[PDB]
Design a protein around this ligand. Structure first.
Ligand SMILES: [Ca+2]
Ligand SMILES: [Ca+2]
Lengths: 371, 371
């Protein structure tokens, strides 16, 4: 337990009258997913749930590891807060007061076997493991991809893979200060509309393409190994080897001494290499395009993250739930995509899924009050 | 700083009369390599040096981070201790009293740029990064490879790559209790003889091939997710999916119930699956060959570990020392292989190398007393 994590959760409930009244104005998942944290990741040290005031019935409060914070305290400009979309709620997840610097996102339907360690998400050498992989979701995909395609170059950017995302508070604040038009746009919306900015992809493509700029006075402060303001011949040879690569030659030596002698080896200082052109330009052309935040593409080896959608064909349900059992990987994500016309098959489906979730996680975790 | 490391060093000195007297009876490297620890790895929290009683002249003692321990206190059977080989000294490196569980080996000529983090060596999910890559050294290579080829299978085993090796005390004690013939053989030797067992390769091939055995009572204690001694139909289906893979079929269901019914689904317990043959054999044939220690082959991306031998051709010296400067990688290892006939070129070589080692590490570190 080197660093705190403090994962978050959402849990919208669409069964009580006070939610469907506000909808009219305009599957017990988390119980078995917060239960997975007690088994396979016992280091997260706090759990938040962001709701609209409504608590779950089975939360044992005063556990000092689980709290609920509503949208009344989070959202700026308290005029948008009657909100019923995920992506609007995602835009104020970093305004939780005693939040640690980094945190797991994992939303509601993320249960996890195959125990989780903090080095699976954030190391210190590397440190953000970016897990690469139609009606309403595709349009927001195209809009976010085009918005990140206006700036930041072009390249190919891959979508993510349904893991619990690890999110830094400072990087997302610099994200929201970069796209202040679209953050307020998606914030001031009621439902899921096709001009949205999805938070995870616009985070993990923002972080992958922030390029820092280092000034010439900072390449003098580093890149000599010395005490103060000395640039001697050892540092000169270190400087010349990082430019003219294949061998190093006498031509580069007399080129460098010709450049220093034209400044009208006599004690190369900081003020000379800041002042003199055609060397500071030739120095900053090599070392100024360093990336801003530490990132790490995953080598697709350990957490292959079984997605495995839950359609209403009971055959495909039973090979899907058995194929979640043949491979007990790190993250698993069962989203519904359920029919509403078949009220007879989608009762046996919800009873069949209960056989799956009790097959792995049958103990009453300490988050749940005794019935 | 999650865990302690406490690296070790050797530093044999072949210049004083009291060493050459004992040799007759039968390059300032570490100063610039212990100096690299103050710059690029400030978490190792103790440094040991194992000698034969002789201290360096420039060690500032009472630093409470650097100590010297001689061979008198380490070696069992105090009859072997007049020793003048590396590999004999390597066989009692884990008898240092206040040693942590894991430790860096790095011997004497290992200086390191490009800062080192504990996740570069030992994580918790993985945790031993095994860095794969003629007169006297080749024979010990063939002997150690054949000794590890007698047991442990056959396969291909690769040599290591001159990094600071991370070594566990318990794994090396189980190594020395496996090869008690060769440990005492190489311990009771005076010099480097061609029947040696090299410590790093016989460690990192021992650790890669210890296979554990799990009893059938332990595959009942795990592999049900339950409280105590219950093996119900959810666990049965989890059990059957991990054997008959492609789909799961009704034939496997009636096969399993036929196996349980022939034990002369009626409450499958622990005593039944321990007692009944042709199921416990069929259960342990799948889950008993799990490896003993966590290991991790390195993907050869970050620490490519410039070796770059130091022969006496001054041209090859200057492209070697410049090519150490073009690539500032994680570990670097300059071993001598120096001629002794040319006393005139091998003075300019040692002065030229001093230009290299002061080009990166010029500050007097806190390990060194002021001259
Ligand atoms: Ca300098
Ligand atoms: Ca059970």
């Amino acid at each position: 337990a080197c660093t705190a994590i403090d994962a978050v959760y959402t849990w919208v409930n669409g069964s009580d009258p006070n939610f469907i009244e506000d909808i009219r104005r305009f599957k017990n998942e988390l119980r078995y997913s917060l239960r997975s944290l007690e088994k396979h990741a016992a280091w997260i040290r706090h759990v938040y749930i962001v709701t609209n005031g409504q608590i779950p019935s089975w939360l044992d409060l005063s556990y000092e590891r689980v709290t609920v914070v509503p949208h009344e305290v989070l959202a700026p400009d308290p005029d948008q807060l009657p909100t019923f979309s995920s992506s609007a709620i995602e835009t104020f997840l970093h305004r939780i007061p005693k939040l640690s610097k980094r945190f797991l996102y994992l939303n509601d339907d993320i249960f996890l076997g195959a125990p989780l360690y903090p080095e699976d998400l954030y190391t210190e050498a590397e440190g953000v493991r970016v897990y690469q992989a139609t009606d309403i979701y595709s349009h927001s995909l195209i809009a976010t991809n085009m918005l990140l395609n206006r700036a930041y170059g072009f390249k190919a950017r891959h979508v993510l893979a349904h893991v619990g995302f690890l999110i830094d508070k400072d990087i997302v604040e610099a994200m929201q200060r970069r796209f202040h038009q679209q953050i307020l746009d998606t914030a001031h919306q009621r439902f899921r509309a096709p001009t949205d900015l999805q938070y995870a992809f616009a985070y993990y493509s923002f972080l992958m393409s922030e390029t820092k700029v280092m000034s010439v006075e900072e390449i003098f402060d580093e890149f000599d190994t010395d005490g103060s303001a000395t640039w001697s011949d050892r540092e000169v040879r270190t400087f010349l080897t990082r430019i003219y690569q294949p061998p190093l030659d006498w031509s580069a030596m007399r080129y460098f001494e010709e450049v220093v002698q034209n400044c009208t080896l006599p004690t190369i200082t900081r003020d000379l290499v800041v002042r003199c052109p055609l060397l500071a330009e030739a120095l900053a052309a090599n070392f100024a395009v360093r990336p801003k935040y530490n990132f790490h593409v995953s080598p697709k080896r350990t957490s292959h993250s079984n997605f495995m959608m839950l359609t209403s064909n009971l055959t495909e349900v039973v090979e899907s739930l058995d194929r979640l059992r043949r491979n007990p990987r790190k993250f698993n994500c069962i989203n519904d995509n359920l029919d509403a016309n078949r009220g007879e098959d989608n009762e046996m489906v919800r009873h069949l899924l209960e056989d799956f979730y009790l097959s792995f996680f049958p103990r009453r975790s300490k988050f749940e009050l005794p019935p």
